[PDB]
């Protein structure tokens, strides 16, 4: 008498003893490539790939029997549910054709584009290699004028109609999936419909991240206002004392990163900065003494040390010429107890920081590793790089600097470095969450339909300039393709993970450090030695997806919400700075403020 | 004094997948315990029996030993009263156990890469392994309602599933060689001796 | 009365009238860039060309209602004919823009293509700069293998799958034409349907070209024995005497012209090579006395003198720092009498013969405008260069420079000087006919079908060493795409050109010294001078394409086809010499010799 | 009668009109030195298919009309009696039996811009050939066909009047040249214009 509960999970069974072994495989060929690049290497990741792929579909079409009213709980449950979703096999063949052509060649059509200078045409740029060098160090206003509309323009116009195709092939797929909408079914990640009737919906995040946008916005008001009034000394005549900024002034190409924004706007000059490269250069440092005082950090709060496997086989250093490899830092979850870490470290400060924050990635993935193969995927797209820039956060610290013995004992901490480190610090994180959220909200719009095509551009540069005060420098009608030209857009990521990816660490920072009983100011929180957090936190990381996310959220602060008090908490010194040398400045935007309409 | 022959046994290259595991009988040997302990290259080494050091002196009826090749994680299962998918459908210790069980790291020559698809264990059974049971029984389970037409299909699944071993695993996923000593006593009178 | 041959009357008086002022404003535009370089000229450049293109496929379009068929006599049908024809109803506009990318793809790889010495990575060269300086002047066989092998490998490995491509579609986009493949459109220029039983056939032309090949072939294995002998001496290891040439020691990039070998291969290197840069400079000579000369040239043979717009309008001087420009001589006819001829000017003797070449371009021109806008091409693909080539012979010989004063009138015209002008002559006219001639075979047979793709390198090679006489230095498998190196290749260029042109110059050179009454060695007629001469040419150059080529010929030199006859009785005293001193070597060639094979 | 004839207004006319509406500028009582015309010289073609100018010394004459008007150079050819062309055909055809001069000279410098000049205008198709000093200004769109125009530029039907195109790097055929062709009538009435 095998109730269709008891019978899944014997077929769950079978699933996780064959399966695990074959996704190992496509995880070692797909590792393979990446660290020997060849045409060969790519056939054979590409292969065993499909392999993977199509044993996945046959596991779907078996899992379908068992249906998930019959099932009773809990986690059995959920895994089936994971299996039902095949993933791809609702879009007729030959739109299916179409659309990998379309998606391929819009990632080509990225990366592929150069731009020229206009009166000489032999000279050519790239943007991942030459463009971002332009980007972030320009101060002339003219040249990174060019570069922004030239790029937007030569690339954007060849985009701006394979995305409106890309548009309905997609919607096409997620109607067939039964998610209306397509933007409607990227948020179905965080969705946890399963918690008896109290679950979260897909459409309540939207809510949830305009109440945030809203609780955040006089920070990045007043920010932004303080911004505009440095940005003026620089270029005198081209930044309205009362309009929102132009797009190309902003640090970066689409100006999602203010942080190369921080030497035209330093508040305390004089006052030295803290960079520990030399020092880590001049102390003998080489990368392996990086990730092992990186480890140490961990093994601190009471996390496991890494894996002999971790050591021998991850690619920690760019090897040289015994081959070519993607130089993009990458942490791998390979599958049995192959954890590795893939970067081309330089012994930097920035390699450092990265470095305790990749090795976060492991640990979660360590941890969680007990639970069934299927709820081996952080809990939610927003937890995982959340979780690493919790280390990263504890880390970066001046005091545990000191005690590293990277910084002189007597590096004197006031008013100022800590309001200026601040400052720095938001461009990077409040900087990013207006834009990210407004990129988005366009997406999910798009998808929605609330727009039409003959507007997308139109409406596009009203919410930059309602919701994140950047204004166009030249106008852009309906054959550009702006939206695309960032990165994530052209190929299709989702966006909202950067924007609750914030909302997370300070919620975690703020308990973690509240357990460690912290005395002190919440941006100089330093956990480590403290195995209590370590707890919590390793209670967190164990469950894994296993949990509906509300809950495994609850169990560390005590709430099963997004809360941004914490990142307003984390800021509110620099916050109240900003205050008082705002009072004499106009802070907000006008919605239409444009440099060419004289 | 014909010094026992546990070399072959503890030495050999050859161990056979964990459901279909070896026994090989020692009889009329004097054994020497001392050795193994003192090689000290085990990972795991924990008589529950007796004590290694005080049982050098004892003389016994019979003396078995099992080999068998595991999983890291799967090296706890091997003792009384343990259970787990190898204790209860592979090799089962009595609850009265009380013998030595030595185990360690086959990863040098147990694993290639690509894999070494070759062991094999026991998923899916009836009812649970007596203790010191072997089933090389290759029938098909039928999970669900419905029979085994005797072909593999849905709700009836194949037995057996092939451990696969990699060099890159992780330290519970490498694959693990065990063998277990086993000793008996009976009104017979009693010749697998050692240094009395 | 209103019959469809009157209406088609009526139809082209009306697009004659109307078209005439637009292609003017087209090519007064396009004049504007050439002559003044920058993206604003470009732009309006492109922007009047828009509108000539649009009007152009209108007026097509409607032409097709008056059929061919019912039409009479007899240029209208021909007008017809090319009218009808409009470019690009054809193709599938997916495979219009994705063909059209290609094709320009090539033409920026080519032009922006680049290669690096080995020792240092950074230093590199472009083909049109350094490359071909390298080539043209450089003794070193590694050095000019590792320019060659460099461009042919990085500029060549590129190209190969846009080439694939690129002919698929271009067979494709030929066959909507109702043309076999597109080799069979380029033949088509030569094709005349004009006549009832005696029109040449696009089949015919390979045939005619085939063997004019063959007839050749003697004068071209006694150059090659010749001047193999001579490379031993400069190169002592490489060259074996049984075996062809190496690709790179042809004194240019792909081997096409022999004319930098001269220096290597001088017969006499003691006489003087005549050069009067010198005694031009001398004499006070300035630009205008070069195009002065020029036009007093074609007056003397009894055609009319410039228009006044030819001196105030052209661009005979480079312009200086005013304006930027490319220098490659053109000659231009903008249309409505206006004649112009750009060139940057300098006071050598090259750019004397290069004035009167050019010059001949604009005589033919001033002399075609009398007859219909459609049927003013010209008479054949190389029937123009042709005709200026024609008049550049008459002037290089040494009796036309001592009535200019260049030379003083005793300086001796020995047998030995002769020779040596012959072999100079020689290896710029002969060598490059069968590297042409190959080269159009290759692409002919590619486009047939007649190649496979995976044995094009194979097959390409084959042909060099057995047509041409020239070998590979190194091994090329099937991802270079040697073929492509070449500017015309890559650019989508018809190369059968040249080679026709070289059999319709001494042809016409021939023809118009006999009418001259000169008595001697053809090479050294002169045609000035001679009023008849110069009214057959004027017959023939006022048709134009209004008749078939074939008749417009037969009035010349009273036959209808491509005769070399005239071509090797014009180098028959360098033939001669050429068998004198080749008897005591090897002549011809094993095909199967390989400097790689040891 | 001393008074001198206009011919100053009419030669040095800032404004011509176009071939098809040529201005007949009519002649009254305006005693005028034909010598002067042709030692001013500056003339591109000055033919009199008559008699000389030099023998018009004493000859006075009923009415003597001026025609001014502007065309293309090639076309100045046609402006002579038993001449075809588009001209002389559709536009203004002078009489087979001619009895008086014509005056053409190079009209570039003022009668043509850069960007193009388009306001002088040509009949280009016409029903039937022109009579000696007929003028047609019909803008009346042409039958080429059977098929009726609407009175809508399209298939067989084309506009009858199309604009000349003149630039100043033009060739000396295409550039502009201004003509003015004077006749003289005699009558049984007094005559009067001498
Ligand atoms: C190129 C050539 O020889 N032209 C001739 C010229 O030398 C000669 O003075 C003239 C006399 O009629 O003729
Ligand atoms: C890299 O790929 C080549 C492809 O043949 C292979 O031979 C080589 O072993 C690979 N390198 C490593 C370290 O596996
Ligand atoms: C690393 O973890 C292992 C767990 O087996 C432990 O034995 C060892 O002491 C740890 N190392 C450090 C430095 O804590
Ligand atoms: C296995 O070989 C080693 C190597 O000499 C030996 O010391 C050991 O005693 C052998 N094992 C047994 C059980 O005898
Ligand atoms: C050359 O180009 C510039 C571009 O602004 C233009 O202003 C100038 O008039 C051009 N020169 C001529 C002679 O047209």
């Given at each position: 008498?095998?109730?269709?509960?008891?019978?899944?999970?014997?077929?769950?069974?079978?699933?996780?003893?064959?399966?695990?072994?074959?996704?190992?495989?496509?995880?070692?060929?797909?590792?393979?490539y990446?660290?020997?690049?060849?045409?060969?290497?790519?056939?054979?990741?590409?292969?065993?790939?499909?392999?993977?792929?199509?044993?996945?579909?046959?596991?779907?079409?078996?899992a379908?029997?068992y249906?998930?009213?019959?099932?009773?709980?809990?986690?059995v449950?959920?895994?089936?549910?994971?299996?039902?979703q095949?993933?791809?096999?609702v879009?007729?063949?030959?739109?299916?054709?179409?659309?990998?052509?379309?998606?391929?060649?819009?990632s080509?059509?990225?990366?592929?584009?150069?731009?020229?200078?206009?009166?000489?045409?032999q000279?050519?740029?790239?943007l991942?290699?030459?463009?971002?060098?332009?980007?972030?160090?320009?101060?002339?206003?003219?040249?990174?004028?060019?570069?922004?509309?030239?790029?937007?323009?030569?690339?954007?116009?060849?985009?701006?109609?394979?995305?409106?195709?890309?548009?309905?092939?997609?919607?096409?797929?997620?109607?067939?999936?039964?998610?209306?909408?397509?933007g409607?079914?990227?948020?179905?990640?965080?969705?946890?419909?399963?918690?008896?009737?109290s679950?979260?919906?897909?459409?309540?995040?939207?809510?949830?991240?305009?109440?945030?946008?809203?609780?955040?916005?006089?920070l990045?008001e007043?920010?932004?206002?303080?911004?505009?009034?440095?940005l003026?000394?620089?270029?005198?005549?081209?930044?309205?004392?009362?309009?929102?900024?132009?797009?190309?002034?902003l640090?970066?190409?689409?100006?999602?990163?203010?942080?190369?924004?921080?030497?035209?706007?330093?508040?305390?000059?004089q006052?030295?900065?803290?960079?520990?490269?030399?020092?880590?250069v001049?102390?003998?440092?080489?990368?392996?003494?990086?990730?092992?005082?990186?480890?140490?950090?961990?093994?601190?709060?009471?996390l496991?040390?890494?894996?002999?496997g971790?050591?021998?086989?991850?690619?920690?250093?760019?090897?040289?010429d015994?081959?070519?490899?993607?130089?993009?830092?990458?942490?791998?979850?390979?599958?049995?107890?192959?954890?590795?870490?893939?970067?081309?470290?330089?012994?930097?400060?920035?390699?450092?920081?990265?470095?305790?924050?990749?090795?976060?990635?492991?640990?979660?993935?360590?941890?969680?590793?007990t639970?069934?193969?299927?709820?081996?995927?952080?809990?939610?797209?927003?937890?995982?790089?959340a979780?690493?820039?919790?280390?990263?956060?504890?880390?970066?610290?001046?005091?545990?600097?000191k005690?590293?013995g990277?910084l002189?004992?007597?590096?004197?901490?006031?008013?100022?470095?800590?309001?200026?480190f601040?400052?720095?610090?938001?461009?990077?994180?409040?900087?990013?969450?207006?834009?990210t959220?407004?990129?988005?909200?366009?997406?999910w719009?798009?998808?929605?339909?609330?727009?039409?095509?003959?507007?997308?551009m139109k409406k596009?540069?009203?919410?930059?300039?309602?919701?994140?005060?950047?204004?166009?420098?030249?106008?852009?009608?309906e054959?550009?393709c702006?939206?695309?030209?960032?990165?994530?857009?052209?190929?299709?990521?989702?966006?909202?993970?950067?924007?609750?990816?914030?909302?997370?660490?300070f919620?975690?920072?703020?308990?973690?450090?509240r357990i460690?009983?912290?005395?002190?100011?919440?941006?100089?929180?330093?956990?480590?030695?403290?195995?209590?957090?370590?707890?919590?936190?390793?209670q967190?990381l164990?469950?894994?997806?296993?949990?509906?996310?509300?809950?495994?959220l609850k169990?560390?602060?005590?709430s099963?919400?997004?809360?941004?008090?914490?990142?307003?908490?984390?800021?509110?010194?620099?916050?109240?700075?900003?205050?008082?040398?705002?009072?004499?400045?106009?802070?907000?935007?006008?919605?239409?403020?444009?440099?060419?309409?004289? | 004094?014909?010094?026992?022959?546990?070399?072959?046994?503890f030495?050999?290259?050859?161990?056979?997948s964990?459901?279909?595991?070896?026994?090989?009988?020692?009889?009329?040997?004097?054994?020497?315990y001392?050795?193994l302990?003192?090689?000290?290259?085990?990972?795991?080494?924990?008589?529950?029996?007796?004590?290694?050091?005080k049982?050098?002196?004892?003389?016994?009826?019979?003396?078995?030993?099992?080999?068998?090749?595991?999983?890291?994680?799967?090296?706890?299962?091997?003792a009384?009263?343990?259970?787990?998918?190898?204790?209860?459908?592979?090799?089962?210790?009595?609850?009265?156990?009380?013998?030595?069980?030595?185990?360690?790291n086959?990863?040098?020559?147990?694993?290639?890469?690509?894999?070494?698809?070759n062991?094999?264990?026991?998923?899916?059974?009836?009812?649970?392994?007596?203790?010191?049971?072997?089933?090389i029984?290759?029938?098909?389970y039928?999970?669900?309602?419905?029979?085994?037409?005797?072909?593999?299909?849905?709700?009836?699944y194949?037995?057996?599933?092939?451990?696969?071993?990699?060099?890159?695993?992780?330290?519970?996923?490498?694959?693990?060689?065990?063998?277990?000593?086993?000793?008996?006593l009976?009104?017979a009178?009693?010749?697998?001796?050692?240094?009395?």
């Amino acid at each position: 008498p095998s109730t269709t509960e008891d019978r899944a999970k014997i077929f769950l069974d079978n699933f996780n003893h064959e399966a695990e072994d074959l996704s190992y495989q496509s995880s070692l060929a797909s590792w393979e490539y990446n660290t020997n690049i060849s045409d060969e290497n790519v056939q054979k990741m590409d292969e065993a790939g499909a392999k993977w792929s199509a044993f996945y579909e046959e596991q779907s079409k078996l899992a379908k029997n068992y249906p998930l009213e019959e099932i009773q709980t809990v986690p059995v449950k959920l895994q089936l549910q994971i299996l039902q979703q095949s993933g791809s096999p609702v879009l007729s063949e030959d739109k299916s054709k179409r659309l990998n052509s379309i998606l391929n060649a819009m990632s080509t059509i990225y990366s592929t584009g150069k731009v020229c200078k206009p009166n000489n045409p032999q000279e050519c740029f790239l943007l991942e290699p030459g463009l971002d060098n332009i980007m972030g160090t320009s101060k002339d206003y003219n040249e990174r004028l060019w570069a922004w509309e030239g790029w937007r323009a030569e690339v954007g116009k060849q985009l701006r109609p394979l995305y409106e195709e890309y548009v309905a092939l997609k919607n096409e797929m997620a109607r067939g999936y039964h998610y209306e909408d397509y933007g409607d079914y990227w948020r179905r990640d965080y969705e946890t419909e399963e918690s008896s009737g109290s679950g979260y919906s897909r459409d309540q995040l939207m809510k949830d991240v305009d109440r945030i946008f809203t609780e955040i916005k006089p920070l990045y008001e007043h920010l932004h206002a303080y911004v505009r009034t440095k940005l003026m000394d620089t270029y005198p005549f081209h930044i309205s004392p009362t309009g929102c900024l132009p797009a190309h002034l902003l640090g970066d190409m689409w100006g999602r990163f203010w942080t190369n924004l921080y030497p035209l706007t330093v508040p305390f000059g004089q006052k030295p900065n803290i960079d520990v490269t030399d020092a880590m250069v001049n102390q003998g440092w080489d990368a392996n003494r990086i990730f092992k005082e990186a480890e140490k950090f961990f093994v601190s709060v009471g996390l496991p040390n890494m894996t002999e496997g971790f050591w021998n086989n991850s690619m920690l250093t760019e090897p040289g010429d015994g081959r070519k490899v993607v130089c993009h830092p990458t942490a791998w979850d390979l599958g049995k107890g192959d954890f590795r870490i893939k970067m081309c470290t330089k012994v930097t400060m920035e390699d450092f920081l990265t470095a305790h924050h990749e090795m976060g990635h492991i640990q979660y993935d360590m941890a969680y590793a007990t639970q069934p193969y299927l709820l081996r995927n952080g809990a939610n797209e927003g937890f995982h790089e959340a979780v690493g820039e919790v280390m990263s956060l504890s880390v970066a610290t001046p005091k545990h600097l000191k005690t590293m013995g990277l910084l002189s004992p007597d590096f004197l901490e006031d008013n100022e470095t800590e309001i200026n480190f601040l400052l720095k610090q938001a461009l990077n994180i409040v900087g990013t969450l207006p834009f990210t959220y407004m990129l988005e909200k366009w997406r999910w719009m798009v998808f929605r339909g609330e727009i039409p095509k003959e507007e997308w551009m139109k409406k596009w540069w009203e919410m930059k300039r309602d919701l994140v005060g950047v204004v166009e420098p030249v106008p852009h009608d309906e054959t550009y393709c702006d939206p695309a030209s960032l990165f994530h857009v052209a190929n299709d990521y989702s966006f909202i993970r950067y924007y609750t990816r914030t909302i997370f660490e300070f919620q975690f920072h703020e308990a973690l450090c509240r357990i460690a009983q912290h005395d002190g100011p919440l941006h100089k929180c330093d956990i480590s030695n403290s195995t209590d957090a370590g707890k919590k936190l390793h209670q967190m990381l164990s469950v894994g997806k296993s949990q509906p996310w509300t809950v495994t959220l609850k169990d560390i602060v005590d709430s099963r919400n997004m809360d941004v008090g914490p990142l307003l908490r984390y800021f509110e010194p620099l916050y109240t700075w900003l205050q008082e040398k705002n009072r004499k400045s106009y802070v907000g935007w006008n919605t239409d403020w444009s440099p060419y309409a004289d | 004094t014909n010094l026992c022959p546990f070399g072959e046994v503890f030495n050999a290259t050859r161990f056979a997948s964990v459901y279909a595991w070896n026994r090989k009988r020692i009889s009329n040997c004097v054994a020497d315990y001392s050795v193994l302990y003192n090689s000290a290259s085990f990972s795991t080494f924990k008589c529950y029996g007796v004590s290694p050091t005080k049982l050098n002196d004892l003389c016994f009826t019979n003396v078995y030993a099992d080999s068998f090749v595991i999983r890291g994680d799967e090296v706890r299962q091997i003792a009384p009263g343990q259970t787990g998918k190898i204790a209860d459908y592979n090799y089962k210790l009595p609850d009265d156990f009380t013998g030595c069980v030595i185990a360690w790291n086959s990863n040098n020559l147990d694993s290639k890469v690509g894999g070494n698809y070759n062991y094999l264990y026991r998923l899916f059974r009836k009812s649970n392994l007596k203790p010191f049971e072997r089933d090389i029984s290759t029938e098909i389970y039928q999970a669900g309602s419905t029979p085994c037409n005797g072909v593999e299909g849905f709700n009836c699944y194949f037995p057996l599933q092939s451990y696969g071993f990699q060099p890159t695993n992780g330290v519970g996923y490498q694959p693990y060689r065990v063998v277990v000593l086993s000793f008996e006593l009976l009104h017979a009178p009693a010749t697998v001796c050692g240094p009395h």
